[PDB]
Amino acid sequence: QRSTSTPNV
Amino acid sequence: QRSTSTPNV
Amino acid sequence: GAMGSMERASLIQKAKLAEQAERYEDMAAFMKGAVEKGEELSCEERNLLSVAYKNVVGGQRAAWRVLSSIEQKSNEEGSEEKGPEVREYREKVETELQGVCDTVLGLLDSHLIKEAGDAESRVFYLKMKGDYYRYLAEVATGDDKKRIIDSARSAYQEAMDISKKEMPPTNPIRLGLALNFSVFHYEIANSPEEAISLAKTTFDEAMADLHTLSEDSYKDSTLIMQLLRDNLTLWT
Amino acid sequence: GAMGSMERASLIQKAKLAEQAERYEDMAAFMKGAVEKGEELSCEERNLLSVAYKNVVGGQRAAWRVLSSIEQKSNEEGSEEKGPEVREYREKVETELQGVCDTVLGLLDSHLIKEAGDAESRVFYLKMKGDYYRYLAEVATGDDKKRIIDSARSAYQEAMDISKKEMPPTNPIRLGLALNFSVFHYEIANSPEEAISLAKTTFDEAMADLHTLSEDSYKDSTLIMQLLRDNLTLWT
Ligand SMILES: [Ca+2]
Ligand SMILES: [Ca+2]
Ligand SMILES: [Cl-]
Ligand SMILES: [Cl-]
Ligand SMILES: [Mg+2]
Ligand SMILES: [Mg+2]
Ligand SMILES: [Mg+2]
Ligand SMILES: [Mg+2]
Ligand SMILES: [Mg+2]
Ligand SMILES: [Mg+2]
Numbered sequence: 001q002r003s004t005s006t007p008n009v
Numbered sequence: 010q011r012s013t014s015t016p017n018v
Numbered sequence: 019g020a021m022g023s024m025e026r027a028s029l030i031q032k033a034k035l036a037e038q039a040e041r042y043e044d045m046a047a048f049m050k051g052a053v054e055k056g057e058e059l060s061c062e063e064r065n066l067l068s069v070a071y072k073n074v075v076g077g078q079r080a081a082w083r084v085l086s087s088i089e090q091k092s093n094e095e096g097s098e099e100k101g102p103e104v105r106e107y108r109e110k111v112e113t114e115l116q117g118v119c120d121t122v123l124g125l126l127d128s129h130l131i132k133e134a135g136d137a138e139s140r141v142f143y144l145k146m147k148g149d150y151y152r153y154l155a156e157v158a159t160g161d162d163k164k165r166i167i168d169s170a171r172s173a174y175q176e177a178m179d180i181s182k183k184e185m186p187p188t189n190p191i192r193l194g195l196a197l198n199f200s201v202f203h204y205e206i207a208n209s210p211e212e213a214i215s216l217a218k219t220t221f222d223e224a225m226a227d228l229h230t231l232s233e234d235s236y237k238d239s240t241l242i243m244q245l246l247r248d249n250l251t252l253w254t
Numbered sequence: 255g256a257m258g259s260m261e262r263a264s265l266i267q268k269a270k271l272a273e274q275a276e277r278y279e280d281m282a283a284f285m286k287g288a289v290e291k292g293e294e295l296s297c298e299e300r301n302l303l304s305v306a307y308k309n310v311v312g313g314q315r316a317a318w319r320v321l322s323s324i325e326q327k328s329n330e331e332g333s334e335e336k337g338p339e340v341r342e343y344r345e346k347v348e349t350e351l352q353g354v355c356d357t358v359l360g361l362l363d364s365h366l367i368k369e370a371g372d373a374e375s376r377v378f379y380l381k382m383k384g385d386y387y388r389y390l391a392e393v394a395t396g397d398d399k400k401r402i403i404d405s406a407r408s409a410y411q412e413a414m415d416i417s418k419k420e421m422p423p424t425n426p427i428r429l430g431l432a433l434n435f436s437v438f439h440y441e442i443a444n445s446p447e448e449a450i451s452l453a454k455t456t457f458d459e460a461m462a463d464l465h466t467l468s469e470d471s472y473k474d475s476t477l478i479m480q481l482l483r484d485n486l487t488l489w490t
Contacts, residue, residue: 039347
């Protein structure tokens with residue numbers, strides 16, 4: 001699985 | 010809630 | 019048309035790719051291109067057409083409902099005036115929705131329905147015609163709301179008459195048509211009793227024909243039957 | 255531009271409506287229109303811009319990955335030849351993705367970054383520049399892959415230098431920048447050790463500053479800290 005980047009808040 | 014119509018298969 | 023230069027088989031191939039990628043606007047454009055080649059569609063190809071446009075209009079309908087709800091709340095007593103923006107944007111989404119419906123109805127009229135002679139193809143297309151007039155009716159408020167409703171009813175009725183003559187009660191197309199016509203009655207035509215009656219009769223006649231089916235066909239038919247039951251539970 | 259005739263405040267209002275309706279293409283167009291009015295953006299307005307384009311490019315990236323995977327599988331030994339269609343459609347989605355990235359980078363260059371003098375605005379925009387060059391790098395394969403990577407690195411680095419001078423270690427923008435720069439290192443730059451080191455140092459320095467925060471700010475900072483930990487778990 002791919003790394004997590006910043007989500008939408 | 011709304012009635013259920015035919016879904017995508 | 020932008021797809022005029024692409025092979026029919028390539029358009030079908032790319033529709034399948036677009037489905038896998040969840041790119042439903044592209045999928046619909048590819049299938050529109052395939053229809054405009056002028057050849058009749060196979061069962062699988064009709065399914066691709068259906069899935070693509072159902073997903074596109076499904077997004078528009080969900081968006082329209084959100085915006086309509088916000089608009090209704092703005093036009094209560096006590097609500098502060100926020101200017102024309104909510105109405106304008108609801109109208110924008112509504113116009114795009116109507117455009118998609120008109121595109122589909124245009125494909126059916128030119129010339130899918132008139133070339134459809136087998137029960138499976140003719141009933142499928144007339145059901146689709148009913149469905150897209152129903153989506154137009156969901157947002158209609160003017161002089162033509164009644165005529166739009168009658169257009170939906172007329173298409174569903176012609177489909178029903180053929181399906182009852184030509185298909186077994188468990189046929190998935192027949193079942194899906196009856197489901198959607200029952201939704202028309204309940205949600206559009208202010209006829210909940212007609213809706214319940216149709217759902218019940220459809221369910222019972224399918225139940226009685228299940229014994230004739232293979233394991234795979236049984237699974238297909240019972241899936242739709244459960245949706246009729248779900249609606250009957252909601253309605254009663 | 256199609257939004258040239260609409261008021262700035264109306265564009266912002268409609269961006270908020272589009273977000274509620276999950277109409278992210280519209281939301282992005284409205285926010286592009288607002289940027290092109292030429293005024294600086296508030297914090298809330300920067301967030302609207304970010305959400306809109308992140309959602310649009312997010313869909314394109316997911317689609318591109320599906321298609322790239324199918325394409326890679328077609329070019330193995332034993333795989334049957336299916337013609338140019340998979341490549342063509344992957345290229346189509348890729349071109350649209352690159353177009354969205356170019357649009358965002360264009361807004362940053364004309365003229366959001368050069369007018370951004372406060373740490374919060376300047377770091378946010380330089381992080382965005384890094385992010386959209388990173389998305390370009392994900393699909394790059396040619397002579398400019400290296401230059402695209404260096405453009406991303408350069409933007410992230412300038413942002414990092416400002417953030418460390420001007421913001422506390424728990425600032426959400428500072429934290430989100432460091433998260434995304436660590437992803438750049440791991441996923442793009444073939445530097446997993448740099449990625450791990452950055453994630454660890456960022457986490458530890460934030461942990462040590464949590465005591466200075468209110469309840470609400472604590473919740474904000476710890477949410478991002480958990481994502482750094484999630485990556486460290488994946489990476490080690
Ligand atoms: Ca025929
Ligand atoms: Ca300034
Ligand atoms: Cl509008
Ligand atoms: Cl293509
Ligand atoms: Mg040909
Ligand atoms: Mg008041
Ligand atoms: Mg209207
Ligand atoms: Mg003005
Ligand atoms: Mg072979
Ligand atoms: Mg390319």
